[PDB]
């Protein structure tokens, strides 16, 4: 399937940024309608693998400040951008498209030393892949210090030139549609750790009796940087430390968690006990694992803290029993990528959920119950969201939940404990009012 060619591209400028552990792409597109029928839709081309690895996708006008309706569609795959007001059959449009993928270049030399610099190999299509023909194009690469090509082609036009921290490619002036044949393989220098959270289980517990919100996060972290040739030698690591080589190294020594303002009662444990190397500073929680995380190593751990409920939960204006909570979806290290997120919110026993919404599309949502420390009844209402490809500081939205919690349900918990105790007391009385003498 191909979308009809209702548009033509005046100019195409693709800039790829490789500074972080994820690939960011901005396209400057100028389009004009070529048919007489007015069309409000534009289609974006993505390869199957890139489509699967897309995390974030948005677009807007080069002039306006608000975003249009840009939705992915579910073997080139397509995203659709919808226009608010239809266009003339022959008129100009200036779009700016932004995307963030969950992929990154693999280390070209897979095994390097403890102090050697790292290089990554990233493979992307070189000419613009689109379903609408383009009469002008350009490509740029930013974010790194050095760029080289792996097996370059003979044709001079299919080659690029260097600027300062930049790599511009050929300014071609006629490209047909679906011309994704030549594949470019670039090698760049990235000397930082590549953090990958394979699974996050984030649990938020809300309590009206204590007026607190408690956050418990379970991370399963890996490092996708170059593996260590010759194995780990604590002597070499100590000789690097005492040499005061604070250079940007590609192994994790300390993580910095950014928490909501006013957090208290921090803790940092793992599957084997409590880790003592953690230190809290305003809004920041610095954490040192038991061992440094070199390329290819795993580390599963748990962090937690507490906050005041009055910052996330507000009361409806129509009644004093309808509450609206706005809960952040991610609170983690600065530069990290997530592959599976399960976000659970626990509302008190007698709460009935009335409305739910997420700022970004989720893969699943569910509601159940779970018993806790004093839940003699059914237990806390557990609302679970499932998300797939999330990036640390581009998924900064907040989930909105509107629920109901009457005063009856508020007071019913001490009542349940009292009924349990009263039943035990009646049982004691019964046991002390009948004789078993012979």
């Amino acid at each position: 399937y191909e979308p009809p060619a209702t548009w033509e591209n005046v100019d195409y400028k693709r800039t790829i940024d490789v500074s972080n552990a994820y690939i960011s792409e901005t396209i400057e597109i100028t389009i004009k309608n070529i048919a007489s029928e007015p069309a409000t839709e534009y289609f974006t081309a993505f390869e199957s693998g890139i489509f699967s690895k897309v995390s974030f996708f948005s677009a807007y006008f080069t002039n306006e400040a608000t975003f249009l309706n840009s939705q992915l569609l579910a073997e080139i795959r397509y995203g659709i951008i919808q226009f608010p007001n239809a266009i003339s059959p022959q008129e100009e449009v200036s779009l700016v498209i932004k995307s963030f993928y969950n992929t990154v270049g693999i280390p070209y030399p897979e095994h390097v030393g403890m102090s050697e610099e790292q290089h990554l190999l990233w493979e992307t299509n070189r000419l613009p892949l689109s379903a609408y023909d383009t009469k002008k194009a350009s490509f740029t690469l930013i974010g790194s210090s050095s760029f080289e090509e792996y097996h370059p082609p003979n044709d001079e036009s299919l080659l690029g030139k260097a600027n300062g921290n930049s790599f511009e490619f050929g300014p071609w002036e006629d490209i047909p549609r679906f011309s994704s044949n030549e594949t470019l393989a670039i090698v760049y220098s990235h000397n930082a750790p590549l953090n990958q959270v394979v699974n996050l289980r984030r649990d938020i517990w809300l309590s009206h009796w204590a007026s607190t919100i408690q956050f418990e996060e379970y991370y399963e972290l890996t490092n996708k940087a170059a593996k260590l040739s010759k194995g780990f030698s604590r002597l070499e690591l100590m000789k690097q430390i005492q040499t005061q080589n604070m250079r940007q190294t590609h192994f994790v020594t300390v993580l910095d968690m950014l928490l909501p303002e006013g957090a208290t009662d921090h803790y940092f444990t793992d599957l084997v006990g409590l880790v003592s190397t953690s230190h809290a500073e305003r809004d920041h929680f610095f954490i040192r694992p038991r061992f440094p995380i070199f390329g290819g190593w795993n580390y599963n751990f748990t962090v937690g803290w507490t906050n005041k409920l009055s910052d996330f939960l507000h009361v409806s204006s129509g009644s004093d029993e309808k509450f609206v909570a706005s809960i952040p979806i991610l609170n983690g290290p600065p530069d990290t990528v997530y592959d599976n997120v399960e976000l659970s919110v626990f509302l008190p026993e007698g709460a009935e959920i009335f409305d739910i919404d997420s700022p970004v599309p989720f893969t699943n949502v569910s509601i159940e119950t779970q018993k806790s420390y004093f839940d003699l009844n059914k237990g806390h209402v557990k609302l679970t969201f499932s998300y797939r490809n999330l990036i640390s500081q581009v998924a900064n939205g907040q989930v909105l939940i509107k629920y109901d919690y009457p005063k009856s349900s508020f007071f019913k918990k001490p009542l349940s404990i009292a009924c349990y105790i009263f039943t035990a007391l009646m049982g004691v009385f019964v046991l002390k009012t009948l004789n078993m003498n012979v």
């Binding site: 194995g231 780990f232 030698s233």
Partner: protein, 65 residues
């Protein structure tokens, strides 16, 4: 007192982890040679470069079976 000439090298094991205060040390048994040479002779081969490697003479090996 320990001197760097006291500890001979390991040719059959490889250090994979040493704790921060050196209390626990974990080694891994290396896999055997594809050619069938002893790990001791691979180690000697690595630790030795001599111009006059050896004389022409002949091996004292036994009968091929």
């Amino acid at each position: 007192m320990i001197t760097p000439l006291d500890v001979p090298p390991l040719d059959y094991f490889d250090e994979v982890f040493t704790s921060e205060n050196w209390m626990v040390r974990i080694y891994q048994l290396k896999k055997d040679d594809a050619q069938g040479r002893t790990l001791r002779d691979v180690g000697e081969l690595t630790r030795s470069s001599t111009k006059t490697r050896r004389s022409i003479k002949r091996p004292e090996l036994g009968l091929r079976v």
